[PDB]
């Protein structure tokens, strides 16, 4: 089980950015690109709701650093109480786990493409 409303992507984003400081090396910029990509989904929810993606993402990142509660997320319905426990929003974990696997494993094949041969119809 997981809780939706953008609370899953924000929780997994800060965990990747924290490892980038410990690893450093040439892959330090790789974890930064994956952390900024997870925050796009919460920022996309603020675009359709007419909110500020900068002010919304900054609140979620500051909440996970102050407290360990991962249930805070974006509210597109504007009912308040950013805690997902009171809003009852629930998502399957098997659904969110495939979103990362299908996106990461597909980009791995796309970045390997060099010569593109397209025949005429």
């Amino acid at each position: 089980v997981v809780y939706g409303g953008g609370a899953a992507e924000v929780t997994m984003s800060l965990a990747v950015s924290e490892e980038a400081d410990k690893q450093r090396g040439i892959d330090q910029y790789a974890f930064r690109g994956f952390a900024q990509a997870l925050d796009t989904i919460p920022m996309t929810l603020a675009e359709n709701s007419g909110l500020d993606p900068i002010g919304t993402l900054s609140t979620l990142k500051s909440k996970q650093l102050k407290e360990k509660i991962s249930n805070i997320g974006v509210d597109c319905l504007g009912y308040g109480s950013n805690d997902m426990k009171e809003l009852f929003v629930v998502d399957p974990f098997i659904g969110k786990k495939q979103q990362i696997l299908l996106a990461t494993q597909l980009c791995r094949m796309i970045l390997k493409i060099d010569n593109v041969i397209i025949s005429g119809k």
């Binding site: 709701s49 007419g50 909110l51 509210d75 597109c76 319905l77 504007g78 308040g80």
Partner: protein, 44 residues
């Protein structure tokens, strides 16, 4: 919180500004290879 204030309309300028930046960065990529003492000449 939503449904109030204002809603953005005529979003084509948002796409026009993106089309102008992408087209401008494409021109800056060809001249980028000529920067610095290691740059190369461009025959036109």
């Amino acid at each position: 919180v939503p449904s109030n204030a204002t809603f953005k309309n005529k979003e084509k300028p948002q796409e026009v500004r993106k089309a102008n930046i992408i087209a401008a960065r494409s021109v800056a990529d060809a001249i980028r290879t000529s920067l610095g003492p290691k740059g190369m000449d461009k025959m036109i």
